Amino acid sequence: IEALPTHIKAQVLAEALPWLKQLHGKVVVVKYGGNAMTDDTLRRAFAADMAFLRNCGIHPVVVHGGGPQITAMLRRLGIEGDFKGGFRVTTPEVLDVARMVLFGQVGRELVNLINAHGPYAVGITGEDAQLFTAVRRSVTVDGVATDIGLVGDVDQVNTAAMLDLVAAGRIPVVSTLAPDADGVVHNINADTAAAAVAEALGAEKLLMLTDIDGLYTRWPDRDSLVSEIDTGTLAQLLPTLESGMVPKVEACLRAVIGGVPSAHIIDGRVTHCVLVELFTDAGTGTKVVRG
Amino acid sequence: IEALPTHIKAQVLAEALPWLKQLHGKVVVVKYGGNAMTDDTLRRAFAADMAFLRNCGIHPVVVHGGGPQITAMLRRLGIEGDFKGGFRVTTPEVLDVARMVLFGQVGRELVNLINAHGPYAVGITGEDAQLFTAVRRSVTVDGVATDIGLVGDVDQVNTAAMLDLVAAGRIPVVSTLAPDADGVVHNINADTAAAAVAEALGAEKLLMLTDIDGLYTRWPDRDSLVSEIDTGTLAQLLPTLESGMVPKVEACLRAVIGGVPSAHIIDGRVTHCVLVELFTDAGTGTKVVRG
Amino acid sequence: IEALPTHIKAQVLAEALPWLKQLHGKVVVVKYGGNAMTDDTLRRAFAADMAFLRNCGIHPVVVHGGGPQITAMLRRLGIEGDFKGGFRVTTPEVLDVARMVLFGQVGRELVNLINAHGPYAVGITGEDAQLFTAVRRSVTVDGVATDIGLVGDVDQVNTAAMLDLVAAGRIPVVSTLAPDADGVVHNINADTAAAAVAEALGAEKLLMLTDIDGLYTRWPDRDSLVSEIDTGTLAQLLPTLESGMVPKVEACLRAVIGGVPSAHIIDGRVTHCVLVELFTDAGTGTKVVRG
Amino acid sequence: IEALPTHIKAQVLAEALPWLKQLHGKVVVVKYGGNAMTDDTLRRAFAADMAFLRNCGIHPVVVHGGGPQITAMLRRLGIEGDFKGGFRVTTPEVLDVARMVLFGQVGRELVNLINAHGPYAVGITGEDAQLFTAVRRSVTVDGVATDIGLVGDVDQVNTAAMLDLVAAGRIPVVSTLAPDADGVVHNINADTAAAAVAEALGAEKLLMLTDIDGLYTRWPDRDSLVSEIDTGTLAQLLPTLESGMVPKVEACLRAVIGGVPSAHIIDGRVTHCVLVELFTDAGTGTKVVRG
Amino acid sequence: IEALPTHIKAQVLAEALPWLKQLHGKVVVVKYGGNAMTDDTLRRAFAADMAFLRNCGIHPVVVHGGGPQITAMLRRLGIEGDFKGGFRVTTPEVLDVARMVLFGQVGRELVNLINAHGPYAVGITGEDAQLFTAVRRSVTVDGVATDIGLVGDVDQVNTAAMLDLVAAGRIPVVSTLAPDADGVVHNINADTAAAAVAEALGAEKLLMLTDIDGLYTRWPDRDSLVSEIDTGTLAQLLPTLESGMVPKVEACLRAVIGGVPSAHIIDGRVTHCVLVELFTDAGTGTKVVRG
Amino acid sequence: IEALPTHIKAQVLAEALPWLKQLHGKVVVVKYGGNAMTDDTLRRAFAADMAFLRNCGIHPVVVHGGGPQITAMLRRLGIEGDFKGGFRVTTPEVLDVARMVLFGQVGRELVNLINAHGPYAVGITGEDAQLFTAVRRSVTVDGVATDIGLVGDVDQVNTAAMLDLVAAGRIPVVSTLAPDADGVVHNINADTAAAAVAEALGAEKLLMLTDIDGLYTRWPDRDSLVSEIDTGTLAQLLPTLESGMVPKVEACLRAVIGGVPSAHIIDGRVTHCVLVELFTDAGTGTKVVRG
Ligand SMILES: COC(=O)c1ccc(O)c(I)c1
Numbered sequence A, B, C, D, E, F: 001i002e003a004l005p006t007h008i009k010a011q012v013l014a015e016a017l018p019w020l021k022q023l024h025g026k027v028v029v030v031k032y033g034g035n036a037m038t039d040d041t042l043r044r045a046f047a048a049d050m051a052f053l054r055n056c057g058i059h060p061v062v063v064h065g066g067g068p069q070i071t072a073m074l075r076r077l078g079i080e081g082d083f084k085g086g087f088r089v090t091t092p093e094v095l096d097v098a099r100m101v102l103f104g105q106v107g108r109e110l111v112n113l114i115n116a117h118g119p120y121a122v123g124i125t126g127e128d129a130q131l132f133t134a135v136r137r138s139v140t141v142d143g144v145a146t147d148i149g150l151v152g153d154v155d156q157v158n159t160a161a162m163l164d165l166v167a168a169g170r171i172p173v174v175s176t177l178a179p180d181a182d183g184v185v186h187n188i189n190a191d192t193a194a195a196a197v198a199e200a201l202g203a204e205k206l207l208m209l210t211d212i213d214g215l216y217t218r219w220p221d222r223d224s225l226v227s228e229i230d231t232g233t234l235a236q237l238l239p240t241l242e243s244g245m246v247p248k249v250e251a252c253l254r255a256v257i258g259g260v261p262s263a264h265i266i267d268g269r270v271t272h273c274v275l276v277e278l279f280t281d282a283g284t285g286t287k288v289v290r291g
């Protein structure tokens, strides 16, 4: 820990200066999911890292999901699911559970972890002050698209009140639930949502915390791994990717095409992954830029 | 509805003018519980009334409880309670349920009901931006006081960020959960809490929505009912009151002694009770002032 | 007064909520003339109504005339008039009298009536801080137009300083006198002027207080009366109207065509007419919209 | 006009610099009466001088009277006066005439004269936005004091809204009429009033435009004239002064004792007297300081 | 000094009022060189004149040169010059001397002279907060252009931070040294620079303090002197001017064509020349306007 | 450089978080002298470190000296010194040289080094906008105190305009020259000055860049070195210190007693010493706190 000469303790800090300039006064949207939210030691480091950005004058906006904890509460409550394709149909009953688990349990832990370093985080959904709206989403079941309930994409973002909040010195911890135009609340996929917030707010970077080292073009060839890719190439390769990392990837493309400078798929198993990806050239992840 | 001559439609409005002057630019804390939150028609009217205040330039702050809905989720989850006196011991397991039911279910309905009239409500607990803190509370079991878990009173209120919020045009819908000084979240009794917010913010009025016509000194003598009372008399009469209305009453006294001009115990069974109590001399409730 | 059940006292208030939302933060120009300014009881109610709007966060701007009081001072002073058509020629002598009666008598009563409810009203003419200018107006005598002295229409409005004033929480009570480009003060017809202010300021509504129930297309067929009309129809019907209500009508059309959402011709004999027309669907008057 | 070498045109300007520093950003109250308001050439110069101060960043506040023009309108109207001592009893009838002559005639000329140089002046009385209040004043008739109607001294000044106005770049032209606490408007002596405004606003200087060269201790010994005097000496000499200059003098003492640095009694017959007194050491007037 | 009747002391002041209106709230760039900076009495008057403008609410920006004092320090240091044409080649050694003489000696005197009247002046070069940049300049030696070292014209001006400074009440005293795009500091000709600042800031007037009465078209015919000229005529006459006044003239044309209303070539031997040129019609100088 | 595992690249950054919280939004005064200003590689790192603080939202204020460069210019100019004790008498001739070397050479390098990372630094002396004043200082020659010319201590600091500057996002690079009350400029010892600025501005930390590892109580016993000390002990030990480090030490005590939390004597030979001392527990220097 300290058997490390100082002369180079100084050097690692001093090589963060370019990215401190790059990110000073800018929005950085961080999608936070996977194991980064399961292990206590990683969780506290993630929190402390949000504190870090905010004591450098960067404006983080956290967007979290919560698949597994939702399904655990549904079984605990004995709510039998219905499944079309692999998707659970989101009934009014399911929606209310998703809402109370995402907003009243998962988001609360992150808010309390970040607020140990200061009065920074505040939790919100699209319902609070109409910050964002949803629009119902059908999924393609297998050729035919069909309805799987009250799920949707982010429809509109109140960019104004959002950047009021972070300029006021606050870290928004977002739960991806939103009203539609008639007031009916839908659950939104947190990867998609994070790309939609990042684009609305003119974020400098989208950070996608995933449980993989990075994007392998030829999974699992160890050296197929890639550290940077354009949108156009990533687009043509999208249909050849593993099931779970497809949402993290179209989020990246919809954001970078949407004008975000770069989207990053990083390893949420590395402790302090965001500090590594933002202020260090030794990034585990993969960068996505337009092209 | 309209078989009412207009010449007096005009008169009822014009007699709201004194209380519009009294309340323009001021904080009004409304504790919202009882049946006012059970019946849909009353609920929508309560929401529309919060919208009303806010389109007159009054600054409402809603504080809600949720006893019955909490205990319903505990039984649904099969969490066996422990009971000292009549109090349920609030385990870490119970606390997390209280939190997710108060913040992720009950507060969400009120936020969505108010936001049908505009981007006004935002939900918060004392955890968000450290708005308020708690301090653990023992209750007197029966002579001896003893511990009944993670319950406490409101400890400190960030008056500053709170009045920033309402001046920004927002209606805070508060869930009474708060960190203590070491970050551990307690459940706070929503009547107490509402008196503590009202005092911190320099509210003009505390409104206590209860399921009774008003305070009867000699329950149930029909004419023992009283429309106004001082603190000192109400204090001496406190030990002679029904079990459930004692918390609504010491909240009133701790607020009015605390410098709030008046606390009001009103009938949440009357539709639009807050509009009646605030802009009309035909108030069902009972007013509490210092003396 | 109070033999009116409360359950419906509550209902009349709660049905003002849509127009409180419609009018919150907006300009409402009220032309104030006729009997509304002759009877003390109506006058005090008009004042209290301006106070009302301002304690709901609406921004009233009052524009008053004063034909009869001017001619009374001219006779009291023994100033013999000259008359072309039915118009009095406005000499420098007449102008100074009009000015001192409109600004130093009539406007002063309204300012003092409104200021019994608070420091709200301030009187002004177009001369103060160059708020508006005039341009001399000839009238068509009977085929030929000819000069009838220092009378004119509103030329330019300093929209900026005007909306500074009402955002500063003030109710402007305007006397319709204005400099021309060379500094010479003209009298302006207060109906015209009110339409010109309303258009300049982006008012939500123009309210024209008149001494009639509303606009009768076939005066005096009792049922020719109409509650709403477009500009285009009202235009084609303008040449068929009574002598005194023509100015109230072209003011309405020049304002609504000018982009004001609606102009209203209301009964200033009804006590609290503006409260009835603004927050109630039982409006005596007639609404004018574009078409 | 120009047969004046420039080398000294430069010198007179450059010797205004100390008083530009002294007066930059400060309030200067100017009481404006006497011949300064009767002759057109002097009047225009007075106006242009107010424009001058305001284009140097000084904050002038003009306070005018109007004895003779009031009595002319009373005779024109055939209102017979009643006289106790030499004072006219101010009936409700007289008050309304005073008000309409001061505010609707006299103040209007000054506003239009100043506004030829820019949108600067705005007229006001104590009735507008409750800027100042009056309190009824009895005068000592001759030993015994008695009532002479609705006349009073300035009671309270809304210092706040007043300095809002001049910081907003406006020159207030004040008519000395004010409500009392029950809303009844009194006429206030414009010398007194000017001392009361100056003290309330923390004026740097009070300027009293009078029709005399200055204060002669032994009128009419030509060399009894004095250019500067303390309060205490001026106090002891007050009972030995001419009838008309006593009000100009107790105004001076009540202001300078009230904390205004200096009061000045200047010759309103000199063209541009205020420019001479403020930016030149060749002042005709007499300075009053505390002592 | 005072044997000058006051009645006309008043008149000279009152004839400054139009130019006080013209210049209130505007930028006036004054290039300050020649004898105006050599004689102590003229220097103090120049300073006091900058103080003057700033206590009238004008925003002066001073730009100074310093040819002779630079060459004196080079000889004092024994730095042998190299000369192409009549130009000294500006070596890194020469540049550092120019910088320390212009910024650390010449500008310091002016700052301390102006700050005797108040905390107004602040010295700056283009290096401070990157206020302006330079671009290297070759001069035409005699037909062929060639390099004469680190000299350049003003490249870009941070108009924003510049007008922040003067609105903050400060008088910038500029030394004409600026970084290029790679950070290398060049010396800039102070006449050119002053025209470049004036254009960037939207100055009302450029004042060029020169050691001549004005521009003589046929030097030295006494009556060839001219008080006003357009750009187009001045352009065609530029190749027929004396060696030293050519830079003062193309500065004038590049500024007035650049949109500055007028450039003025004035006599810095006249004491208080800027006060004479700005607030008096007896200007020694010559005005340049577009045409 | 990169043969350093990342897992601990992450760790060194994450251990800066406490001092980022401690220093966010605070003033840090850095005295910059010694070798830190002689070697190019150290100089650029010092600059980049000031950039660092400013892209974390810390407010650095640099105070530099320049003994050796002054004496070099005096010899280059052939100015013979006069010496009382070991002190050079500071003649008007010497002062002007000190001023032009400190402000026009030394401060210019630091400004240009910092401005390679952004428009941040601005140079100033106490002469600019009267930011600080001096008061002449005699030194005790050897028992008797005597005059050694225009040298003094910092007299008063305009705290207001100073913190305006850094909140405006600027890094002040201060040259220690200041006017006295009569406008005469003195040279101030840059260690003293830095303690005086730090106290005036409520700095969080004073950083004293020195050419020693730290304070040795028993120089040169290698282990007499100390990492933290109180004021009271340091006071009693002051008379037993080496000649050159006495000024760095009484600056520390006058600042910490003056209410600065801590003063630090650090090794300006270590590259990036300020980054090490501020964001790392491996500090070479010695901390001074009150006691
Ligand atoms: C626009 O929304 C807000 O301002 C907001 C929402 C939730 C909060 O906890 C807080 I503090 C502010």
Ligand SMILES: COC(=O)c1ccc(O)c(I)c1
Pocket: C122, C123, C124, C128, C129, C161, C162, C165, D122, D123, D124, D128, D129, D161, D165, D170
């Ligand atoms: C732009 O005009 C004004 O601001 C104004 C005019 C009259 C007043 O009585 C007041 I207070 C403000």
Ligand SMILES: COC(=O)c1ccc(O)c(I)c1
Pocket: E122, E123, E124, E128, E129, E161, E162, E165, F122, F123, F124, F128, F129, F161, F165, F170
């Ligand atoms: C943009 O530059 C400045 O704000 C500035 C520069 C130098 C100063 O002495 C001062 I005070 C402000």
